[PDB]
Short mmCIF file of N, CA and C (backbone and C1' of nucleotides) in Angstrom, two decimals:
data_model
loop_
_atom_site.label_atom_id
_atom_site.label_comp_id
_atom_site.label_asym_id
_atom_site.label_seq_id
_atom_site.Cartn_x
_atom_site.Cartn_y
_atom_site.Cartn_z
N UNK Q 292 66.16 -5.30 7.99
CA UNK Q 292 66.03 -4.09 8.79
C UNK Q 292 64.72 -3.37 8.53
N UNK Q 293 64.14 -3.60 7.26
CA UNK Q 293 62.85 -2.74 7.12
C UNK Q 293 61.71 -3.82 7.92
N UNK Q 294 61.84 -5.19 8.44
CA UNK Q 294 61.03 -6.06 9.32
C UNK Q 294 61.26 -5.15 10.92
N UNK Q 295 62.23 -4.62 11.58
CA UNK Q 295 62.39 -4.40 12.61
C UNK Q 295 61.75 -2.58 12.88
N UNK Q 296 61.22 -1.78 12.40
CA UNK Q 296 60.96 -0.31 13.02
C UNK Q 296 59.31 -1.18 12.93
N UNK Q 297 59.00 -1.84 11.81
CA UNK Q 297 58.09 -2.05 12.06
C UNK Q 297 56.92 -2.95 13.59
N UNK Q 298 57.94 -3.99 13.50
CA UNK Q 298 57.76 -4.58 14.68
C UNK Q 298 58.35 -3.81 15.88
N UNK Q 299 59.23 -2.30 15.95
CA UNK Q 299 59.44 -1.41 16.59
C UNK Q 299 58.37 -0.42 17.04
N UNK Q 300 57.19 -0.46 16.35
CA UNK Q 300 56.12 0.48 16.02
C UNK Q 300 55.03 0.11 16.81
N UNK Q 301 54.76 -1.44 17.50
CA UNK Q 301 54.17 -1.78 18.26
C UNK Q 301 54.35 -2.90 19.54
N UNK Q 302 55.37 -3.24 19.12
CA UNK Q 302 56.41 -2.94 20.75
C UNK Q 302 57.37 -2.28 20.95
N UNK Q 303 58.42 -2.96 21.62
CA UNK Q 303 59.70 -2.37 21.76
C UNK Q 303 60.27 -1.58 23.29
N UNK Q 304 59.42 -1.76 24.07
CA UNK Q 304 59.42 -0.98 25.92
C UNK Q 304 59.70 -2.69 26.27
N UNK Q 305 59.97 -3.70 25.89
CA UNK Q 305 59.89 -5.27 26.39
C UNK Q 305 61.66 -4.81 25.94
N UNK Q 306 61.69 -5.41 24.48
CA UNK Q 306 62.81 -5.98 24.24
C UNK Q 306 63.04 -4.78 22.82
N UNK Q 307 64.47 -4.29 23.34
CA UNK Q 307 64.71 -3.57 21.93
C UNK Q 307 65.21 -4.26 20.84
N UNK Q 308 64.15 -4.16 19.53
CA UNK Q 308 64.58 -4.71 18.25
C UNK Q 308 65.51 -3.94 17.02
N UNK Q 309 65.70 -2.82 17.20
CA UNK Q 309 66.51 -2.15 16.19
C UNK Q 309 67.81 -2.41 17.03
N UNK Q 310 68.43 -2.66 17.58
CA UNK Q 310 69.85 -2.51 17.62
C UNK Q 310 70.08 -4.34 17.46
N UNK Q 311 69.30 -4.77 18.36
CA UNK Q 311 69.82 -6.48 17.82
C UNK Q 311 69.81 -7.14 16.47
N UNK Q 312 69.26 -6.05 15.60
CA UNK Q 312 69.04 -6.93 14.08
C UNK Q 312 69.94 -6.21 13.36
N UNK Q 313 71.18 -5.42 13.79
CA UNK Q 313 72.19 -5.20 13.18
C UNK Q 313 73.31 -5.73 13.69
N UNK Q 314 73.30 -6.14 14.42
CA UNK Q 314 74.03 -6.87 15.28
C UNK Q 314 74.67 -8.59 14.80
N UNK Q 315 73.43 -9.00 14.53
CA UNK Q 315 73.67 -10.11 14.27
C UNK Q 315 72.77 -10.37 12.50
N UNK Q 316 72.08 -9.68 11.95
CA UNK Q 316 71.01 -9.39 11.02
C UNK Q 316 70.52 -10.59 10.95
N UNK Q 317 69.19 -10.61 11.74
CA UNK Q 317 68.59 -11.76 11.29
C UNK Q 317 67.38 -10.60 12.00
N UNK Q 318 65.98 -11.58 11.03
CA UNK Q 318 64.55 -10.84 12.24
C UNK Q 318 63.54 -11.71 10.99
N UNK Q 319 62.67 -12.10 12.04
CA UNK Q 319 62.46 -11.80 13.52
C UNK Q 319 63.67 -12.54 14.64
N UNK Q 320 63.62 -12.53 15.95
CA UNK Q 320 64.90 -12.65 16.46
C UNK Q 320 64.55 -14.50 16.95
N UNK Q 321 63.92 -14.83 16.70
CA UNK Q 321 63.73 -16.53 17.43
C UNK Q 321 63.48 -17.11 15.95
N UNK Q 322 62.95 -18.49 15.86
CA UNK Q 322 62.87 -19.65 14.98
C UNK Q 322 62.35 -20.65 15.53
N UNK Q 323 60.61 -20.34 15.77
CA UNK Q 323 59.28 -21.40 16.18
C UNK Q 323 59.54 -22.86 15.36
N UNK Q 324 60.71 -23.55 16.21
CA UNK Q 324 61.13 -24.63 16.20
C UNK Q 324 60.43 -25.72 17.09
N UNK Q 325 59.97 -26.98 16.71
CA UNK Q 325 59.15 -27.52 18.31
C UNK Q 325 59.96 -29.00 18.10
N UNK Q 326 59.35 -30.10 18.82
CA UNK Q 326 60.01 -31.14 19.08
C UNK Q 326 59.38 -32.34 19.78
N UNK Q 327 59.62 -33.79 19.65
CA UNK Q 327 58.28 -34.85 19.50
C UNK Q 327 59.44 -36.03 20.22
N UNK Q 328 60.35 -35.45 20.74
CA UNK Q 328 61.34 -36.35 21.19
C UNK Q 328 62.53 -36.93 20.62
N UNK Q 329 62.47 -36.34 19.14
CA UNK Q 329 63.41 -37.27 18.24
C UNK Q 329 63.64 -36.30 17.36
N UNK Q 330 63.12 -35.60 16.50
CA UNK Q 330 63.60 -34.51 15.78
C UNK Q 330 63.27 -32.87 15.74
N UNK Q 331 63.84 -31.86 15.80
CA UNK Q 331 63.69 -30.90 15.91
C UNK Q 331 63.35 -30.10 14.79
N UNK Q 332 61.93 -30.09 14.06
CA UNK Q 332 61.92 -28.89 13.39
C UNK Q 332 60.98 -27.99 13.61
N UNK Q 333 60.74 -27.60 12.51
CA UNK Q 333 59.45 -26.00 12.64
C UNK Q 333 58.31 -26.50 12.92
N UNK Q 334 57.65 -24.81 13.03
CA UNK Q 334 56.30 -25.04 13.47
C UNK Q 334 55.49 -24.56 11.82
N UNK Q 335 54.70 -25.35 11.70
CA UNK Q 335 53.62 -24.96 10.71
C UNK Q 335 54.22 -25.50 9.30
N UNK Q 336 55.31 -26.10 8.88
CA UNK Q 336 56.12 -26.52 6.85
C UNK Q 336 54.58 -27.66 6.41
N UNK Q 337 54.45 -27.13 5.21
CA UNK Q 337 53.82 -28.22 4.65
C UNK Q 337 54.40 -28.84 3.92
N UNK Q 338 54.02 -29.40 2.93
CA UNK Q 338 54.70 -29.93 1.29
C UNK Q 338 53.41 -29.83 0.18
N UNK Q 339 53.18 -29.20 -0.66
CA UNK Q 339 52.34 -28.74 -1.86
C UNK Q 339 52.90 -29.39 -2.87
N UNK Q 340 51.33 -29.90 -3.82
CA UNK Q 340 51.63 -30.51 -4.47
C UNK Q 340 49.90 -30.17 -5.40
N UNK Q 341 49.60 -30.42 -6.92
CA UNK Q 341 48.76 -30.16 -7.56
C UNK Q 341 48.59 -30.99 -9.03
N UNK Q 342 47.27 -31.00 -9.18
CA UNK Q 342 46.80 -31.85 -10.29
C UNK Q 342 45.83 -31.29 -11.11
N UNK Q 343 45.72 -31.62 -12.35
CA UNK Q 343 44.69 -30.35 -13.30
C UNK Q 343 43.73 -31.94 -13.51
N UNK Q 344 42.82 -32.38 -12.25
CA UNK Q 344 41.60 -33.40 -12.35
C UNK Q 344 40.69 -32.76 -12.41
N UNK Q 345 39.62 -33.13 -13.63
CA UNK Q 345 38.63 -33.19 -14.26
C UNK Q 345 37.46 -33.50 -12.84
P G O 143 -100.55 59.15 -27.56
"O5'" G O 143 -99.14 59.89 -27.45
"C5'" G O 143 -98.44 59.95 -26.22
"C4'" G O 143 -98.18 61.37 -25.80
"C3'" G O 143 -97.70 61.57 -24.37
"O3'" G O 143 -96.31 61.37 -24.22
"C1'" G O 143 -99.48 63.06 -24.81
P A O 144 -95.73 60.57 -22.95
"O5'" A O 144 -95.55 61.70 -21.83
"C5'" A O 144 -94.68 62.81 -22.03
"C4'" A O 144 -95.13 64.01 -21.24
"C3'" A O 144 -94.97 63.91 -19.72
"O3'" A O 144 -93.65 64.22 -19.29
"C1'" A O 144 -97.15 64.63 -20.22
P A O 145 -93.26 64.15 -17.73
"O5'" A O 145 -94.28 63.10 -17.10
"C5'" A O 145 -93.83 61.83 -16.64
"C4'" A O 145 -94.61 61.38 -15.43
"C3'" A O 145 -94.28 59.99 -14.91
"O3'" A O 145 -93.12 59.96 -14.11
"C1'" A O 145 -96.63 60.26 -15.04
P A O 146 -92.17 58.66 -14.10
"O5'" A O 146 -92.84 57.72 -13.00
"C5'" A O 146 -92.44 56.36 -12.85
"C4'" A O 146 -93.40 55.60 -11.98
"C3'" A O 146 -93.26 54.09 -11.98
"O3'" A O 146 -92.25 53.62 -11.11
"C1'" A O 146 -95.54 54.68 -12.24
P C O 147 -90.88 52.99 -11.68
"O5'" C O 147 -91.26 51.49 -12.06
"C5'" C O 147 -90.56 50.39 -11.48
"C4'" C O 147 -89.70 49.68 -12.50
"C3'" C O 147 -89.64 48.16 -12.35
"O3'" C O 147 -89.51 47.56 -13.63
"C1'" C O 147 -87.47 49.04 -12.16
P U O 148 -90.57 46.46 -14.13
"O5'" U O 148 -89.80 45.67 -15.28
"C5'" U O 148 -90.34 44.47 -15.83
"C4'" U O 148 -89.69 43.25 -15.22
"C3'" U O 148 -88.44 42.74 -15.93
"O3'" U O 148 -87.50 42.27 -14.96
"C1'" U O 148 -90.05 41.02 -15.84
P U O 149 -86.00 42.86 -14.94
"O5'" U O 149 -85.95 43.73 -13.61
"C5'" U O 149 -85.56 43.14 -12.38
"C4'" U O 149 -86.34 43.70 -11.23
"C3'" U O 149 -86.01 43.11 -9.87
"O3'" U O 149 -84.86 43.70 -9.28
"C1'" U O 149 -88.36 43.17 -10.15
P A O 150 -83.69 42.77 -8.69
"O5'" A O 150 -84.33 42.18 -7.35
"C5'" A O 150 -84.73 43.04 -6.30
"C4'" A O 150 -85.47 42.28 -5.23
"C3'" A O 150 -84.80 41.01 -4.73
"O3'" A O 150 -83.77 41.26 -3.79
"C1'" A O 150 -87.10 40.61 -5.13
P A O 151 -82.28 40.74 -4.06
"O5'" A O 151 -82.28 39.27 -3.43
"C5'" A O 151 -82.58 39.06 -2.07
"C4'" A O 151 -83.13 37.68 -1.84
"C3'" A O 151 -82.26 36.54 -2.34
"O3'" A O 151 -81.21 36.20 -1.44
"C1'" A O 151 -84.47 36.20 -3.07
P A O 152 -79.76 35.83 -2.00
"O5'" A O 152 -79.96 34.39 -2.66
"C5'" A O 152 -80.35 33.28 -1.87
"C4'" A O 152 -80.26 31.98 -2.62
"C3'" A O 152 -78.93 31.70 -3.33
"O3'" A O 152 -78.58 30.33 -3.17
"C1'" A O 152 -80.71 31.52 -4.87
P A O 153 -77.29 29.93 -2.30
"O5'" A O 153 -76.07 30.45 -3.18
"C5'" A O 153 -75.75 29.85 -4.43
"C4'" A O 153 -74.30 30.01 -4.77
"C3'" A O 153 -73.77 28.99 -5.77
"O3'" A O 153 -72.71 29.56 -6.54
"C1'" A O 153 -72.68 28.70 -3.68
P C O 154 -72.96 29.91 -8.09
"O5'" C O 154 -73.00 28.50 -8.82
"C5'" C O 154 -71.81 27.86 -9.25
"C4'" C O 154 -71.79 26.40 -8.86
"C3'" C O 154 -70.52 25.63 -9.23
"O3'" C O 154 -70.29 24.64 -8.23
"C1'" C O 154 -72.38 24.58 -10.20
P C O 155 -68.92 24.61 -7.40
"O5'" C O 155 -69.27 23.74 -6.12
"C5'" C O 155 -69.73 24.34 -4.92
"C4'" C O 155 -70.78 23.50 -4.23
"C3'" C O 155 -70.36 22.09 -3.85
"O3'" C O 155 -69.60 22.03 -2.65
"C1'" C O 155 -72.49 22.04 -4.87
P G O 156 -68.49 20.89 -2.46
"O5'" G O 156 -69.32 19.57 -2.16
"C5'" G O 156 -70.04 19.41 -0.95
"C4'" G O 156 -70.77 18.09 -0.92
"C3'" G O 156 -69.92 16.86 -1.15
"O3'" G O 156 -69.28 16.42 0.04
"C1'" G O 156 -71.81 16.76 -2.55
P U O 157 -67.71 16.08 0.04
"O5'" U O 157 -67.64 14.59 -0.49
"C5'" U O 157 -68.21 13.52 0.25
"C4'" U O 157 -68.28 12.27 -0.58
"C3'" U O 157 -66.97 11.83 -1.22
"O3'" U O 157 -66.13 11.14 -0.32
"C1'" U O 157 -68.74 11.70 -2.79
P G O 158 -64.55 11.42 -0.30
"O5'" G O 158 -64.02 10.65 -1.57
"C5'" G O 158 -64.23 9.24 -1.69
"C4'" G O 158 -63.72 8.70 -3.00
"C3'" G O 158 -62.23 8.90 -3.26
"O3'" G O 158 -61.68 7.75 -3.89
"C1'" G O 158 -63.49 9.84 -5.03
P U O 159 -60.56 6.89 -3.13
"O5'" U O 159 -59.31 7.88 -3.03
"C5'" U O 159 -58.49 8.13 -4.17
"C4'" U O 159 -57.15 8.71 -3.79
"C3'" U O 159 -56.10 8.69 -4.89
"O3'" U O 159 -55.21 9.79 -4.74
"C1'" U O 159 -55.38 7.33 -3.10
P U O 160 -55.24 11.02 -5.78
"O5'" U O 160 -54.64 10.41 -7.12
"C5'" U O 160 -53.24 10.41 -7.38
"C4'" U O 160 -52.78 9.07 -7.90
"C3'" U O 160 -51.27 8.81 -7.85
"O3'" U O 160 -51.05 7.44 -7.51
"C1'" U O 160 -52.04 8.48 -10.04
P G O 161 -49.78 7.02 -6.62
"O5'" G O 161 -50.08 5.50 -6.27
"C5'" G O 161 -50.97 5.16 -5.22
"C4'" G O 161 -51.88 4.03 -5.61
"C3'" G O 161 -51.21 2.73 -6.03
"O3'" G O 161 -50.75 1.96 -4.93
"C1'" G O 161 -52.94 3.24 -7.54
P C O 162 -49.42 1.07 -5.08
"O5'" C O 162 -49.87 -0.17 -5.97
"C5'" C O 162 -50.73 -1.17 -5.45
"C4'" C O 162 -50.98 -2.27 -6.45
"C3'" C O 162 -49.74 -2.99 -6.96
"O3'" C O 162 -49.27 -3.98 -6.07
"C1'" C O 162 -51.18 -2.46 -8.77
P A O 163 -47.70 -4.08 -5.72
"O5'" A O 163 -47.10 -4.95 -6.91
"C5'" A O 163 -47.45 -6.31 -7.04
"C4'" A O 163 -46.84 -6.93 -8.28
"C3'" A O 163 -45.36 -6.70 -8.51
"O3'" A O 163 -44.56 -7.56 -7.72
"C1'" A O 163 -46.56 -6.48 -10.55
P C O 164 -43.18 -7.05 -7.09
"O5'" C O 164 -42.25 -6.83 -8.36
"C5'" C O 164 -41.83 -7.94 -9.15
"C4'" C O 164 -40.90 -7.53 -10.26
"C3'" C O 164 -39.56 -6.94 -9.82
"O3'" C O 164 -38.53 -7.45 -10.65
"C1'" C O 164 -40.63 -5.47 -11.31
P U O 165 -37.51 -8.55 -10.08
"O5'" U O 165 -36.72 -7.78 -8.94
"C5'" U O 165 -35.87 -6.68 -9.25
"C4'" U O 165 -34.91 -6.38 -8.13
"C3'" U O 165 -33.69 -5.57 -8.54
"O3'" U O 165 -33.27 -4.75 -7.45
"C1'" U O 165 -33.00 -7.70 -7.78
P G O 166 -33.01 -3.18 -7.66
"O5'" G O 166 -31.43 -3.07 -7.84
"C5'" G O 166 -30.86 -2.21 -8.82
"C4'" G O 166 -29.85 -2.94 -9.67
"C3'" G O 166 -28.45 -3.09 -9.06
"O3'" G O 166 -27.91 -4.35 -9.46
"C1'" G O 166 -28.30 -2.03 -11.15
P C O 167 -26.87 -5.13 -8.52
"O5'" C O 167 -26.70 -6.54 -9.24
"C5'" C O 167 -27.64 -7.57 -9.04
"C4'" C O 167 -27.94 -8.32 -10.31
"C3'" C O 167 -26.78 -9.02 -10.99
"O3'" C O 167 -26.43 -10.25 -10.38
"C1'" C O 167 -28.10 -7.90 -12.60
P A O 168 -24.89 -10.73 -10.37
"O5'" A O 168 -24.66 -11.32 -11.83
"C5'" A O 168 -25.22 -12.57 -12.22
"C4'" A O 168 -24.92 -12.86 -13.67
"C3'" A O 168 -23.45 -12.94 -14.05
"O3'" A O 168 -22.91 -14.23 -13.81
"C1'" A O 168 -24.57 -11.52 -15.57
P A O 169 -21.57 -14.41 -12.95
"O5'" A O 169 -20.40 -14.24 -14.02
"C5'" A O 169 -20.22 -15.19 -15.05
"C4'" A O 169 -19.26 -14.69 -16.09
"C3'" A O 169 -17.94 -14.15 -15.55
"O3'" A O 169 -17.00 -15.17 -15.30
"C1'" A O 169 -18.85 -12.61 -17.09
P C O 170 -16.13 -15.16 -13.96
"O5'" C O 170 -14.94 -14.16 -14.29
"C5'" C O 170 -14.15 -14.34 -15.47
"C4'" C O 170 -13.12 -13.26 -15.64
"C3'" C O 170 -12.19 -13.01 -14.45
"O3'" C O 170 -10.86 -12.79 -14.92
"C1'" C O 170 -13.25 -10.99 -15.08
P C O 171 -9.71 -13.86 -14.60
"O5'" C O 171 -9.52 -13.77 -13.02
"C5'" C O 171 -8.83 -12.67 -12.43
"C4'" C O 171 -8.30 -13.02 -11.06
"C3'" C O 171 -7.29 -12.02 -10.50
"O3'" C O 171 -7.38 -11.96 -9.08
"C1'" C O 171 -6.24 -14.12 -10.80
P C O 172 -8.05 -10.69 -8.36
"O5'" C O 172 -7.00 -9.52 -8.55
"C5'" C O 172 -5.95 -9.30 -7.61
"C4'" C O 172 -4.61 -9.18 -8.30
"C3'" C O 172 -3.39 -9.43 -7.42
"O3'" C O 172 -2.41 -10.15 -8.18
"C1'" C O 172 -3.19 -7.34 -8.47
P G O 173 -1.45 -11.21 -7.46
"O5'" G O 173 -0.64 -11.86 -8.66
"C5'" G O 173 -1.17 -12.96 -9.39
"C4'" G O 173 -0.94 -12.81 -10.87
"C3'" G O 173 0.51 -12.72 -11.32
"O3'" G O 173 1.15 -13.99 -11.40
"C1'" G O 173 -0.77 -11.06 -12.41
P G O 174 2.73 -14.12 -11.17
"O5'" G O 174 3.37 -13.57 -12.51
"C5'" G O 174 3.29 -14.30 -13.73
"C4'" G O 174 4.07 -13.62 -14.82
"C3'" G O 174 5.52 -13.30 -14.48
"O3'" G O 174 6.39 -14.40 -14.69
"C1'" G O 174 4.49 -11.37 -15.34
P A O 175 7.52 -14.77 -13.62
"O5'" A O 175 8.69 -13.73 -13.93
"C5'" A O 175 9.43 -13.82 -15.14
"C4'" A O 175 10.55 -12.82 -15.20
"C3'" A O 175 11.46 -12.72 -13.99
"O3'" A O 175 12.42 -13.76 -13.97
"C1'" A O 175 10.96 -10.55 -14.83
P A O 176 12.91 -14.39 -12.58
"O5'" A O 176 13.83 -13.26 -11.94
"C5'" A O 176 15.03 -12.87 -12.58
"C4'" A O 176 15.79 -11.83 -11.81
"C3'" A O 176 16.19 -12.22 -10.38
"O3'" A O 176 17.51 -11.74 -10.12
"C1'" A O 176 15.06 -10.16 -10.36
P U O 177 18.74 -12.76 -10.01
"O5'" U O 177 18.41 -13.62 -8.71
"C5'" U O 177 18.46 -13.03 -7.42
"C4'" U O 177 18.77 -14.04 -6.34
"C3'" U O 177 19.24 -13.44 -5.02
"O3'" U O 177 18.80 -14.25 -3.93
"C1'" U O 177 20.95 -14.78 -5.94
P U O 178 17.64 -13.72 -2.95
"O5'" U O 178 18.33 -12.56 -2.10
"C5'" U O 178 18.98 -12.84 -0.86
"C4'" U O 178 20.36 -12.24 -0.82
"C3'" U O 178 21.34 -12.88 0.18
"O3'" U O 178 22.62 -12.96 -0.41
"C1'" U O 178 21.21 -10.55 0.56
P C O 179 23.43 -14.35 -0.37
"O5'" C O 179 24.23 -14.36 -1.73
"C5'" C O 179 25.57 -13.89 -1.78
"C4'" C O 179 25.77 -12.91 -2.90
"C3'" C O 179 27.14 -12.29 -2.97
"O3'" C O 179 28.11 -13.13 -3.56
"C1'" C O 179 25.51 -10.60 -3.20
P U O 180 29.43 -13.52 -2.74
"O5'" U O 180 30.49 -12.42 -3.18
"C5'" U O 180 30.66 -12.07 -4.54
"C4'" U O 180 31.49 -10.82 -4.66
"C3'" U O 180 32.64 -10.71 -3.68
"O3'" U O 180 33.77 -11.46 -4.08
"C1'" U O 180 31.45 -8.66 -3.77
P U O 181 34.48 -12.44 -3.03
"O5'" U O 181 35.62 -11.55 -2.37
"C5'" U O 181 36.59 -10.89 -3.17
"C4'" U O 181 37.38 -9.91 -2.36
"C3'" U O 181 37.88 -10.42 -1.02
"O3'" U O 181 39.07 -11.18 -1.14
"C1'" U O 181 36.90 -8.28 -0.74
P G O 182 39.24 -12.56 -0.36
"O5'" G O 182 39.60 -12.11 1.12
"C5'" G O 182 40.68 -11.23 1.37
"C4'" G O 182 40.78 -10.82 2.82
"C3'" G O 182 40.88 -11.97 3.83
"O3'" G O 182 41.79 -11.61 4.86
"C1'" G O 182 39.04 -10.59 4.37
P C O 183 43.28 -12.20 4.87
"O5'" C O 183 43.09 -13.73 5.26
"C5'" C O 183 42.92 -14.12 6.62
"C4'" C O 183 42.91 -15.62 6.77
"C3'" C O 183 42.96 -16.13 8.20
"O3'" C O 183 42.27 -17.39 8.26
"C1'" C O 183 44.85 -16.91 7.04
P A O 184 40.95 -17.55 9.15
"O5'" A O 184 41.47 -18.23 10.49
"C5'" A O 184 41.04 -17.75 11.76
"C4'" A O 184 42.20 -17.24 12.58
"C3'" A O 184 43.04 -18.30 13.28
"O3'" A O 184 44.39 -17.85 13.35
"C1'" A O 184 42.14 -16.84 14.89
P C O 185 45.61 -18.89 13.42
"O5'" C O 185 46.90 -17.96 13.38
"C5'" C O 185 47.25 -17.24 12.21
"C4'" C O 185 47.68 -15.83 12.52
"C3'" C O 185 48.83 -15.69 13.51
"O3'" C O 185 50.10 -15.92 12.93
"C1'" C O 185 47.11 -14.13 14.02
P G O 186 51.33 -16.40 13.84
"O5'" G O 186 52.05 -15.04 14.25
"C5'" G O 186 52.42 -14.09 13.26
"C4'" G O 186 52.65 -12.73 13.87
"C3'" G O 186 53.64 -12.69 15.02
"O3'" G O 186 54.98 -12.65 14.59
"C1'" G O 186 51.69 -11.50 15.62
P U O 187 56.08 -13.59 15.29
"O5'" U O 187 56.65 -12.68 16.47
"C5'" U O 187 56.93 -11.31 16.26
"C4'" U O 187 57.00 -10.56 17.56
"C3'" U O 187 57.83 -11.21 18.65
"O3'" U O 187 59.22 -10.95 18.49
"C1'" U O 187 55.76 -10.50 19.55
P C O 188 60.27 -12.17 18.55
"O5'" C O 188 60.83 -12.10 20.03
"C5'" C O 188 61.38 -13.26 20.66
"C4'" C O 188 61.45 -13.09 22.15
"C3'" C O 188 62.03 -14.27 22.92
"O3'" C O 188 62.77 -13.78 24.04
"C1'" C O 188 59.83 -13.86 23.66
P G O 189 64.25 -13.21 23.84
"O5'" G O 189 64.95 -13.42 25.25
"C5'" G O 189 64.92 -12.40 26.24
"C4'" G O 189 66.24 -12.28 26.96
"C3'" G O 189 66.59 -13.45 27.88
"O3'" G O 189 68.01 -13.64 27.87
"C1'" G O 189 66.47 -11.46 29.14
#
RNA sequence: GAAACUUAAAACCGUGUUGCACUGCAACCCGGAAUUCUUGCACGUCG
């Protein structure tokens, strides 16, 4: 809820965000999911990984 | 003895370069030290 006045603060005349994120509490209200024909996940996951080379 | 100017007239003048030769010159770095550097996701929101 402290994610939503904020993102309330510069929109919110589109789509009202304070009443839907008590509603269901989740925010932001979507999940930039994409898709390649065969599996559905996110947009942008990496996997990190590190080495202390000389 | 008492009485009659060794006087009159006459430029110490005429001619003549304080002139001739001579570098205010020779040698000398406006030179030695100094990062256009410090912070900053081409990103957020979907009846």
């Amino acid at each position: 809820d402290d994610m939503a006045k904020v993102l309330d603060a510069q929109f919110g005349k589109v789509v009202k965000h304070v009443d839907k994120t008590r509603e269901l509490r989740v925010s932001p209200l979507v999940l930039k999911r994409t898709k390649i024909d065969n599996i559905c996940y996110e947009m942008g996951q990496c996997e990190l990984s590190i080495r202390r080379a000389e």
